[PDB]
Every structure is written in structure tokens, then in C-alpha cells.
Write a protein that binds this ligand. Structure first.
Ligand SMILES: [Mg+2]
Lengths: 443, 232, 43, 86, 76, 166, 58, 45, 122
DNA sequence: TTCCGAGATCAGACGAGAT
DNA sequence: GTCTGATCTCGGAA
């Protein structure tokens, strides 16, 4: 997963600094490594490594635990570092589900890492009042009201109890009264909630508008009683479905009951195992639609129908000519979508065999496209890394000839086209990574 | 045949010749007789160093046809070796300054080193001082033939000529015949009399022989040539 | 394996064309000319 | 000989292409925050500085940088709305 | 001070090795020589007169060293 | 001007074994580092002292003597706070050329900052009026090797007043 | 062949200056060479450097 | 010198030793006894 | 030829000039034509360099003055770079210290600047 | 119940140099 | 055309 590590080098470089990236990315490359061993292998002085790990434990990227030697081996979790890419999307759904106050709550909780209640409410009392009218001061009591209102739906969970090992020092991590207790954001709750938007958009854009809302109210009343490791949601009765409907609807119980047995019986199938398994194939199909036209996408859906029945029917079952079809198979083979010939049983003969049958394997085509999408955002940021250092002469002139200004508006058209496009490929990551996490046992 | 076992370790070597050997007891154990035609070809780059300036001037007038001579001159700064056959040698003799290289012929007193090609022990390569004799055979003293395991029944053995002055001393000191008289298996001497000399000196030291001052001064005065001519 | 070998012995110093350290290349030689770590000038 | 002409092509053009800047309307909201926090993450306390510049500078001299209403009321509530583990 | 005070045959070879090549590049000769034109024959005249401007740097194999002047050694 | 501590492996050829090393290294090191700008360092001039000279090896090839030499050499490197005194050895319409006296004619002042009577109009007009002083302002050196100048300066002239000469 | 296998393992040993015999990698094979540190070449008959009867009569 | 009942003694013995093979041809273990004065007792051993 | 220490400046113009004056007159004692086919760039830099330093009337400048001026300088609180400018520039008149001199802002006071003219003249 | 012993098959190599 | 250790498959047992 080298392209994954390419992003963690890119994500820390833009956010904090360079040595916090370097000591950071080395720890991703060599793992459970002590404090002196990290400073000797990266060639970094020990005073800067203590600072760089201090920022890294604050934003919860490096976790420390000692087992046997009495010497703490730091360890960085890889998949947390890529969640910085989703950071402005984590802001936005707290604006759709909470006000501007609580949206700023998850913001400075994502920004400054570990926060106590006594600090984060004091900070938003500065930012929200300075943008509101002076003399019309925003009262902080409503912040404490919406602060717990996030926590009752469990969007913010507290930090695990600190080990307080001798090697670890308490004074350095806090940045400089009451002590309180710290927390990060519960971004795992978001990955339910981002999946809640994913299934409700999967039904509404396929079945009907009224079908999706009963999926939403099913999932909105199954939030605390499940977790992300739940194979499917908690089972509900249809009578509390009629109780939990929104007030915008007026549908009679028996007609929605017909839609309830309609929605329960589909090819799609609430089976949370089958939901992410069906949404991932549409993400695959939207990539071949993006890349190889509707004709090759037509045979790409054909192998998702029959598992191992190929090349004696695919020239027939899509009616496209043998010349035009077989270049689409080998292009789906060479780009690892078509997977392979796992049926040949004649012994050691490419020429004489029982005829190789194509078969898509959904996860090998998944893990590649996730590795491809990790590679994709490397080419996005590095371009925005490229176009920045040249144009610095004219950013401060506003703070100017006609080609001088024209380079700026072609820059600002470019960066805003790049930065918007970092997020549109980001929604493909989570839609596929949640499918990856759903088929992974013992993790 | 590959590059490891035959091109990186066992690689072919310039300044090296090969003839048939024939005996010569009239040399010291440390000297090989080198033919003239070979000694005019194998050359030693002797740099000019205030002590061989008149000696190299004297031999560069001879050029590559008379034996104590030379056939290449580099100038002091990587000028191409000047094949000393076409031009004026005396104009190259007078213009010869310090520092530059003369590739003089294999002269007597130079250090060549033998090898008999099935090398089985340390003693198959040995250095030898080189005296330019008049023939095309490599002639050495027959005491040093059991280290080479070399009989004279049509056997050939190679003669390398070390070029740098550091590799000339490493031949003379380490690999000279006066140093390696003794094999490193036992400590026994390998260079000692073979065949006729043993049956010569047995028949001489046998109890029955008696020489008068006729034959006594004749046998004794055989031992007076070549570093031995100046002793009473 | 990422095998970093140093170049020692004789089967590698002959291949690389380094003077081998076995035998005459064990030690090294200095020169005995007139030298000393001298005093500097006052600045 | 059929391909022995030049590098295949400088680039290979795919007749079908990318759709658009997909999800056009709503990522105006996230897209400014992409640039908003990056304006504030770089200008934060949680960053490092190039002290290798200052050890590189032997030209240190004076007169250069190299040389040089929260309206709120008290309360205290500590909630265990969160997990009791780890 | 701990190694052998005898000049080995590998030290006599290289001292004669490089004092020959030094004197074949017009080095100053220390023995007021008597017509020897072979630079190697000058160097053995330098050794027997014990005038060679060379100090042998003897490496103990741990990495420590021990110097030895060629004046300060017992040749054979 | 500034001292620069440098370390070099100086090879004395074996026909100089009569002379003392610390002199005969110094004759080599002047031929190695004179009139040569070192990148990010400045214009070396000559040898100040040899602060530490360590032991003369002699390698298996050359037969020469290679002494690793620690030394100090004086170099030319303005400190971005120096008011120098040079001479105008040239006038270009984009900016004047000043030269320090027989030192280096490679200091090229851009001219935008003196009093609003500034132009060089190709008939060698120095300045439209109201030894020459100079303020060296930036360090700027470009490493030359690029395929199979180099300390140029930018030089200013603020409102000094220049009481003696305008 | 047996000459070749022998010398392709045994070539990189030399008696170092503190009388130890080490490999090329620094590892010690012998602490003194052969117990006494004596040349077999210079060694006298009976594996003894002197053979004292001969030297005393000499 | 390599160039120069049954037990192997030649070069195929020295080649057999240098290889240090696990199984050799003609391996022989000699053994001294406690009572080495009578053929009947060593018969019994 | 790696440079270990990039900087270490206290070489006042007199120091460098003096070193060059001893060097120029000392190199000619051993001046060589053997090395002409090799190196001659050294001669040019030293020769011309002497003249630019000579421009400053370090002719009649003395070694003791360096400490004597320095003893006065330490009281003023000017930085080491500033003092080197003060010795090397050798401001002839008040206007250079008054205006040309570095760190004029604040520290001028029209007090020690007047005193400096007496010290610089000395 | 698994694991280690003993049955098959597989490797790279088999001196210098010379015309 | 064998001589070779390595590395794979079978099988009987605490
Ligand atoms: Mg024969």
C-alpha cells in the first residue's frame, strides 16, 4: 500500500509541517519504534522528535503502549491519517444535522485534536460572537445545550484513559482554572451517518422518494443500538415504523406496508452486508462507465450476473461483434477488473485446457480501485503543490499588469477545480472502504 | 567461460610471453635467460629520474632495433606514446626531459616472473632477474626446476613483466628465488641439485678421487665467473 | 535481500581492482617529511 | 516494422472521458472549508518552524525579525455522555 | 609498542615498493648514490643505510594503530 | 570579508619532498582556491593559516603524499550590511555597473531606489543630477555545471545624502 | 577442483598484527596461528623451530 | 600433495573429509577395551 | 574541499591587508616559474586586492589601533558587524556615521554619535 | 487430534593452459 | 551421466 503512504506524506505536509510529516511518515514505514530509535534512523535531533510526536499524539495519529521492555514503542495507525482528507465533509453534515454552532463544535474538535468541554465552548464563544452583531452577543448557554445534543446522538466520544507511563510526560501535550477531561470527535459515528446518506440516496435515486424515507427513519431510530461492526441493523417492527415517520408524510399504514414488503424483497435487499456490497459494484460500474464506454460497461455487468460462464456466451449475451468485444475483455483483464481464468483444470497447458472462463472478483477489483484512488489524490495535491510557489509575487500585490492578473484568475480557477475534485474522489473512498471494512473479519 | 571465472579473476595479461624452455647451468639460481627478440618486445616504462637520464638518452638513440634501446616515449603529459621508429631518435634524445616515460627494452637486471601453467603450489610463480641472452628459449638454472615441476622435454612456461615500480619490488622481495628456497608445506628446500649435479658431486666427493694441482686448479677455477671473478 | 556487502577479502578486491588488504596491503605507509600542526595568526 | 516508427504516442487519448466536476452545487460549502482550514492549519500553534534557517544565518543583527470580548458566564458540568472503556 | 619489532617481508616489500616509485619520480635521494640507474637498486641502498623517509602505519585489526619508523626496525 | 574553515586533501607530488609541508601545502592550496567563488560561501582569495595539518599518507598508487589539511582561508562575502566603496567600470541602461577596485568587476547594481532623477540613457550618463559608495544587498550565486556570473550581487544606493560628492 | 574449493574458502585469512588470525569479516578463527605463531616454512624438522642438537654443535 | 577390510586413503578420502559429508564410504570406529589380553573376552564385546 | 565552517568574521580590513602585505612580499621570495604552466590566478587576486584595501588609508594604520578602537567600541553597544563597518568604513566625517552608518535609528541620540566622531578620528 | 521421520525428485558441477 | 543437499509428499504415533 505504498500509494497510501504517498498520501500520508502529502496530508501532513500541507497541514502541520515537514518534520512532523517526516517523523510521522517514517513511523508509518517502520512501526512500533521507540523514541531514541526514531531520532537515530530519520536523522532528526531528539528535541524536534519530542515536539513532533507531541503534535502527533494531540491529533491522535500516533498511539503509544509498552509491553515488555519497559520502553514505550510509539505506533501510528495508518487509516486515521487519511481521514484528514474527509475533514471539510465532516464539517458539513454537522451543518445539515445541527446548527452553525454545533458545526463549529466538530470543527475545532477536528482541528485542535484533544479538547475539554471547558475550552471548546470558550473558543466558539469568541468565533461566533465576532461574526455576529456587537451588542447582540451570542449567549454561550445555547452552545452547552447543543454540545450535549451532539453527544446524546453519540457524534462525539471521549478519549480512552491515558496510560500515564513514566516515559510519557503529562505537561508537554496540553497547549498553554479547571482540568476537565479530553475528547476527540467520534468520526466512526460519521461513517455510519455518511453511510446513512449513502443508502438513502441509493434507494431514492432507484426505487421512489417514499421508499427512501422509511429507510432513513429505520436507520435514524437504529443509531445507538448498533455499531459499525454490526453485520446488519437491529430488527424492527412495522408498527413503530408508522410511529417514527416524519410529519411531512401522510401515507396510510397499509399502502406503505405494501411498499414495506416491496422494499424488503428486491435484488438490492435492512441488510447492511448486502447494502454496501451492492453499492460497491455500482461504484465499479460507474468507473467502467467513466472509462470504457457503455459497450464495455455492458459486458462488465454481464460477469456480475453469471459467475463462471464466459467467452462462450459473452459474444452472444451482448450481441456486440467478436472483434469489438474481445478488446473489451482484455482491457478489463489488463487493468485487473476482469480478474482471471480460475477454472482451467487441464494440466499445465495454455494451448490445451478446459477453456479459461472470466470471472469478476469483487474485492480484488475493489482493493485495486481504492489503491488507484489513493494514487489519484497524490496527483491532485502535487499539482496544487506545483502551482503555488510560482504565483506568490502577485498574491501580496493585492494585500499588476494584465497578464499578471490573468495568471491569478487562471490559478484560482485551477486550485478551486483541484480542491473540489479532491472531495469528489473522496466519496468513492468511503463508499468502497466501508465495503472493505464490512468484509474484513478479526479487525 | 563467464565473466566471473575467467574474465574477472583469470584475465589475460599484457607484457607477457611464452617460449619453450631449455637448460642453462651457467646462470645463478636467480636469473632467467630471456631471448633477444622477446626482450626487444616486452618493455618496462622507466620514468626519467636524474639517475637514468644519461642511461635512457644512451639507449633511445638505439631505438627499437639494437637491443639496449627503447620503442616508445610518452611525453610528461599523456602525449601518445611516440613509436620511436619513424622520427629522429637523437632529436627525441635531446628533447627528453625529466618526468616523462621511456618504454625501454627488457634489459638485464630487470625483474620478470615465471609461471608454469599447471600451477599447483606457491612456487610455480617465482620472480627472476632477467639477463638478455642470444636465443629464443627461456633458459634458467636447473636447480630451480622442481619448484616449477618443469622438465625440458618440450615444456613451455610463461614470463610476465611487471610494469609499475611497486610491483617490481613485490616480485623481487616476496617472490624472488633467493627468498623462496623453501616450500611452505614442510620447510624443506625445493631448490637444490637435480640429476647430474648430484651424481657429479657424489662422484667428486667419493673417497677414491685424487686430483693433482693440474686438475685441481682446473676444477676450482671453473667457479670464477659472474660476481665470482673478483675473489682471490 | 538488500545485501550491502563491504568490499573485503581478496575475491572482491581483485574483482573491483582495489589493492587487497591481505599481505602487503594490511598496513599503510606514511611519509616522514617536515611538518607540524603550527600556530595560527592572531585575528 | 509495423510499429518501428517512434514512441507509440506522446499520450493516448481515451474517446470517453470524465463526466464533469460531479456534485456541482453543494461542495461550494465544503470547498471553501478546504481552503479555510488550510489557511488556519498552517497559521496554527500545532506546526513547526525552520530553526535550520536560523542556524544557517551567521548574519544576525538588530532591527530585523531574525533578532526580534469573550462575553461568558461561569458554569461547570462534566458529562459522561460518552464511552466508559479503554 | 606491542607488535613485532622485526620488519616483516611484507613491510620490506612495500617500503621498497613505494620508495622505488618515489625515487622514480625525482625524489630527493638520501644515499649519495654511485651510478645505480635502476630505482629499485637505489632503494635497497636506502634501506641498508637506514635512510628512508617512511613511517609504517601498522593497523591492529580493532582499528587502533601503531606507528613504526623504518629507522626503528630490525631488517634482515 | 570573513574567515572560512575548510578541509581539503592536498596532494604533494614527490619531487617537492625537500620543502617543508606547511609551506608546500600552502603553495598548492593557493593554486586551488584563488579567484574562485565557492557556492553559498563566497569568493576565496588566499590562505590565512593552516590550523591543523594531519599525517602524510602515501597511497598504493601515486607515490605522492596526501595530507588531509584543515585550514582557514579569507574569503570575500558581503554581510548584507556593508557600505562598500567601488568604481563605475561600466554603465548599462537597465542599471549601472560598479566594480570594487581591481577586486571583481562582477557586482551589478540594479538602480531603482535613488532620488527621482534616475535614468541611464545609453550615452554613459551616470545619474541625472540632484570613488562611489555601494550598498551590497542580496547574496546570489548560481552553480555553473548543468550538462555533459556565479556571484553577481544586487547593489543599492539609498538616501545617503553623499555630502562630499552630490 | 579440490584445489579450487580449498582456495575459494581459505583465501581471505591473514595473521593480523596482534598475532590473531581473523577472517575478512573480522571474526577470529585462531587466537595465535597454530598455537605458537610460527611459520611452517621457517619451521625446522619435527615441527620445532630449532632442533637444538644441531645449533649447539654448530 | 593432493596432486602427488578396506579404508579409503587417497584424494577420495581427503575430498571426503573436506566436504564433511554426513554419510561417508567406509566409516570406521576403533575401540579399546577394558580387558585387552584375551581374544575370548573381546569376542564377547 | 568540503567547507566545515561557513563563517567566522572578525577579519578587519587592516588584518586582511596586513596578511596580504606579508604574503605578497613573501611569495616572491619563493616566486616560481615552474608553477606558471600550472596556476597564476592567485597572483592576480592578491595583487589587485591589495589596492582596494589600500584605497582605505590603512597605510599608516596600526595593529594596536584594532584593540584601542575596540576598547572604545564595547561601551557604545554597537554589534560586532556594526563595529567592523565602523573600522572598515572608517567614516571620515560625521555625515557617514550620522546618515550612512548602520542602526542610525533610535541609537543615534546626537550624543555618542558626536563622541564616535572623536573616537573615529582618533 | 498434529509432527516429525522417511519415503522421491531435483540441483549445479565435473582441473590448468596452450597451438 | 552420476554426486549432490533441498524441498516436497506420506504415515505411524502420544
Ligand atoms: Mg614435461
Amino acid at each position: 500500500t505504498q500509494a497510501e503512504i504517498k498520501l500520508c506524506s502529502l496530508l501532513l505536509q500541507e497541514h502541520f509541517g515537514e518534520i512532523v510529516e517526516k517523523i510521522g511518515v517514517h513511523l508509518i514505514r517502520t512501526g512500533s519504534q521507540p523514541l531514541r530509535v526514531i531520532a537515530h534512523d530519520t536523522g532528526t535531533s531528539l528535541d524536534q522528535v519530542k515536539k513532533a510526536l507531541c503534535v502527533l499524539v494531540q491529533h491522535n495519529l500516533v498511539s503509544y503502549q509498552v509491553h515488555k521492555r519497559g520502553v514505550v514503542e510509539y505506533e501510528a495507525q495508518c487509516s486515521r491519517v487519511l481521514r484528514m482528507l474527509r475533514y471539510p465533509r465532516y464539517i458539513y453534515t454537522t451543518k445539515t444535522l445541527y446548527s452553525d454552532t454545533g458545526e463549529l463544535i466538530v470543527e475545532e474538535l477536528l482541528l485542535n485534536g484533544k479538547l475539554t468541554m471547558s475550552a471548546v465552548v470558550k473558543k466558539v464563544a469568541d468565533r461566533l460572537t465576532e461574526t455576529m452583531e456587537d451588542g447582540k452577543t451570542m449567549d454561550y448557554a445555547e452552545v452547552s445545550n447543543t454540545f450535549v445534543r451532539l453527544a446524546d446522538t453519540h457524534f462525539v466520544q471521549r478519549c480512552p484513559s491515558v496510560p500515564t507511563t513514566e516515559n510519557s510526560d503529562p505537561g508537554p501535550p496540553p497547549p498553554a482554572p479547571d482540568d476537565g477531561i479530553y475528547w476527540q470527535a467520534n468520526l466512526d459515528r460519521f461513517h455510519q451517518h455518511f453511510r446513512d446518506q449513502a443508502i438513502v440516496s441509493a434507494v431514492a435515486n432507484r426505487m421512489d422518494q417514499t421508499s427512501s424515507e422509511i429507510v432513513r427513519t429505520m436507520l435514524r431510530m437504529s443509531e445507538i443500538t448498533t455499531s459499525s461492526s454490526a453485520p446488519f441493523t437491529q430488527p424492527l417492527s412495522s408498527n413503530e415504523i408508522f410511529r417514527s415517520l416524519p410529519v411531512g408524510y401522510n401515507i396510510s399504514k397499509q399502502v406503505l406496508d405494501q411498499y414495506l414488503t416491496l422494499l424488503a424483497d428486491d435484488p438490492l435487499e435492512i441488510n447492511l452486508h448486502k447494502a454496501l456490497a451492492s453499492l460497491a459494484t455500482a461504484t465499479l460500474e460507474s468507473v467502467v462507465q467513466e472509462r470504457f464506454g457503455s459497450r464495455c460497461a455492458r459486458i462488465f455487468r454481464l460477469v456480475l450476473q453469471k459467475k463462471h460462464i464466459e467467452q462462450k456466451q459473452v459474444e452472444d449475451f451482448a450481441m456486440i461483434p467478436a472483434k469489438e468485444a474481445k478488446d473489451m475483455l482484455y482491457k478489463m483483464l489488463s487493468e485487473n477488473f476482469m480478474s482471471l481464468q480460475e477454472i482451467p483444470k487441464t494440466p499445465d497447458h495454455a494451448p490445451s485446457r478446459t477453456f479459461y472462463l472470466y470471472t469478476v472478483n469483487i474485492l480484488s477489483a475493489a482493493r485495486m480501485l481504492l489503491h488507484r484512488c489513493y494514487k489519484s489524490i497524490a496527483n491532485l495535491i502535487e499539482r496544487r503543490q506545483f502551482e503555488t510557489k510560482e504565483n506568490k509575487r502577485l498574491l501580496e500585490k493585492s494585500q499588476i499588469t494584465a497578464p499578471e492578473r490573468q495568471q491569478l484568475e487562471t490559478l484560482k480557477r485551477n486550485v478551486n477545480k483541484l480542491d473540489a475534485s479532491e472531495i469528489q474522489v473522496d466519496e468513492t473512498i468511503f463508499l468502497l472502504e466501508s465495503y472493505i471494512e464490512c468484509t474484513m473479519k478479526r479487525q | 567461460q563467464g565473466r566471473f571465472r575467467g574474465n574477472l579473476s583469470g584475465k589475460r595479461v599484457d607484457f607477457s610471453g611464452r617460449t619453450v624452455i631449455s637448460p642453462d647451468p651457467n646462470l645463478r639460481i636467480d636469473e632467467v635467460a630471456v631471448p633477444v627478440h622477446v626482450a626487444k618486445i616486452l618493455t618496462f616504462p622507466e620514468k626519467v629520474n636524474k639517475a637514468n637520464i644519461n642511461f635512457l638518452r644512451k639507449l633511445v638513440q638505439n631505438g627499437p632495433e639494437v637491443h639496449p634501446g627503447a620503442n616508445f616515449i610518452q611525453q610528461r603529459h599523456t602525449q601518445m606514446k611516440r613509436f620511436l621508429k619513424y622520427g629522429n631518435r637523437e632529436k627525441m634524445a635531446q628533447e627528453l626531459k625529466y618526468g616523462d616515460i621511456v618504454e625501454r627494452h627488457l634489459i638485464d637486471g630487470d625483474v620478470v616472473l615465471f609461471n608454469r601453467q599447471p600451477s599447483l603450489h606457491k612456487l610455480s610463480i617465482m620472480a627472476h632477474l632477467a639477463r638478455v641472452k642470444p636465443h629464443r628459449t627461456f633458459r634458467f638454472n636447473e636447480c630451480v626446476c622442481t619448484p616449477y615441476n618443469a622438465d625440458f622435454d618440450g615444456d613451455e612456461m610463461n614470463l610476465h613483466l611487471p610494469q609499475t615500480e611497486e610491483a617490481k619490488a613485490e616480485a623481487l622481495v616476496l617472490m624472488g628465488t633467493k627468498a623462496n628456497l623453501v616450500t611452505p608445506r614442510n620447510g624443506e628446500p625445493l631448490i637444490a641439485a637435480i640429476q647430474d649435479f648430484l651424481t657429479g658431486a657424489y662422484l667428486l666427493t667419493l673417497k677414491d678421487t685424487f686430483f693433482d694441482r693440474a686438475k685441481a686448479c682446473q676444477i676450482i677455477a671453473s667457479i670464477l665467473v659472474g660476481k665470482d671473478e673478483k675473489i682471490k | 535481500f538488500g545485501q550491502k556487502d563491504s568490499v573485503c577479502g581478496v575475491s572482491e578486491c581483485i574483482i573491483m581492482g582495489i589493492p587487497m588488504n591481505i599481505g602487503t596491503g594490511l598496513f599503510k605507509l606514511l611519509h616522514k617529511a617536515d611538518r607540524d600542526p603550527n600556530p595560527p595568526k592572531r585575528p | 516494422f509495423s510499429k518501428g516508427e517512434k514512441l507509440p504516442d506522446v499520450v493516448l487519448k481515451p474517446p470517453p472521458l470524465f463526466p464533469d466536476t460531479d456534485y456541482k452545487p453543494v461542495p461550494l460549502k465544503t470547498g471553501e472549508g478546504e481552503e479555510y482550514m488550510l489557511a488556519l492549519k498552517q497559521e496554527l500553534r500545532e506546526t513547526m518552524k525552520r530553526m535550520p534557517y536560523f542556524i544557517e544565518t551567521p548574519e544576525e543583527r538588530q532591527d530585523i525579525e531574525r533578532y526580534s470580548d469573550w462575553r461568558r458566564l461561569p458554569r461547570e458540568m462534566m458529562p459522561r455522555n460518552k464511552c466508559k472503556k479503554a | 609498542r606491542i607488535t613485532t619489532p622485526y620488519m616483516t617481508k611484507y613491510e620490506r616489500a612495500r617500503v621498497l615498493g613505494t620508495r622505488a616509485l618515489q625515487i622514480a619520480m625525482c625524489a630527493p635521494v638520501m644515499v649519495e648514490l654511485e651510478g645505480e640507474t635502476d630505482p629499485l637498486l637505489i632503494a635497497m641502498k636506502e634501506l641498508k643505510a637506514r635512510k628512508i623517509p617512511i613511517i609504517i602505519r601498522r593497523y591492529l585489526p580493532d582499528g587502533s594503530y601503531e606507528d613504526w619508523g623504518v629507522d626503528e626496525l630490525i631488517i634482515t | 570579508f570573513v574567515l572560512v574553515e575548510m578541509v581539503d586533501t592536498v596532494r604533494i607530488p614527490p619531487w617537492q619532498f625537500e620543502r617543508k609541508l606547511n609551506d608546500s601545502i600552502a603553495e598548492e592550496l593557493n593554486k586551488k582556491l584563488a579567484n574562485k567563488v565557492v557556492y553559498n560561501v563566497g569568493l576565496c582569495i588566499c590562505l590565512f593559516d593552516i590550523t591543523k595539518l594531519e599525517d602524510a599518507y602515501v597511497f598504493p598508487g601515486d607515490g605522492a603524499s596526501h595530507t588531509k589539511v584543515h585550514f582557514r582561508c579569507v574569503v570575500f562575502h558581503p554581510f548584507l550590511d556593508e557600505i562598500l566603496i567601488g568604481k563605475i567600470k561600466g554603465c548599462s541602461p537597465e542599471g549601472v555597473h560598479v566594480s570594487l577596485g581591481f577586486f571583481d568587476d562582477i557586482l551589478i547594481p540594479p538602480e531603482s531606489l535613488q532620488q527621482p532623477a534616475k535614468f541611464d540613457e545609453a550615452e554613459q550618463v551616470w545619474v541625472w543630477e540632484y570613488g562611489e559608495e555601494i550598498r551590497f544587498r542580496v547574496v546570489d550565486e548560481s552553480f555553473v555545471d548543468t550538462s555533459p556570473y556565479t556571484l553577481v550581487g544586487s547593489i543599492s544606493e539609498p538616501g545617503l545624502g553623499l555630502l562630499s560628492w552630490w | 577442483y579440490m584445489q579450487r574449493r580449498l582456495v575459494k574458502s581459505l583465501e581471505d585469512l591473514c595473521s593480523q598484527y596482534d598475532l590473531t588470525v581473523r577472517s575478512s569479516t573480522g571474526d577470529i578463527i585462531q587466537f595465535i596461528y597454530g598455537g605458537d605463531g610460527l611459520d611452517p616454512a621457517a619451521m625446522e624438522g619435527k615441527d620445532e623451530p630449532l632442533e637444538f642438537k644441531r645449533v649447539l654443535d654448530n | 600433495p593432493g596432486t602427488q577390510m578396506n579404508i579409503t586413503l587417497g584424494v577420495p578420502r581427503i575430498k571426503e573429509i573436506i566436504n564433511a559429508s554426513k554419510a561417508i564410504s567406509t566409516p570406521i570406529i576403533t575401540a579399546q577395551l577394558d580387558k585387552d589380553d584375551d581374544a575370548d573376552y573381546a569376542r564377547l564385546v | 574541499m568540503e567547507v566545515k565552517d561557513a563563517n567566522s568574521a572578525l577579519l578587519s580590513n587592516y588584518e586582511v591587508f596586513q596578511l596580504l602585505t606579508d604574503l605578497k612580499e613573501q611569495r616572491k621570495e619563493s616566486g616560481k616559474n615552474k608553477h606558471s604552466s600550472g596556476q597564476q590566478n592567485l597572483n592576480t587576486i592578491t595583487y589587485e586586492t591589495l589596492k582596494y584595501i589600500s584605497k582605505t588609508p590603512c597605510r599608516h594604520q596600526s595593529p594596536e589601533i584594532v584593540r584601542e578602537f575596540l576598547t572604545a567600541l564595547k561601551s557604545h553597544k554597537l554589534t560586532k558587524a556594526e563595529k567592523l563597518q565602523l573600522l572598515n568604513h572608517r567614516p571620515v566625517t560625521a555625515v557617514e556615521i550620522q546618515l550612512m552608518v548602520e542602526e542610525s535609528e533610535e541609537r543615534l541620540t546626537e550624543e555618542q554619535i558626536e563622541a564616535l566622531l572623536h573616537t573615529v578620528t582618533s
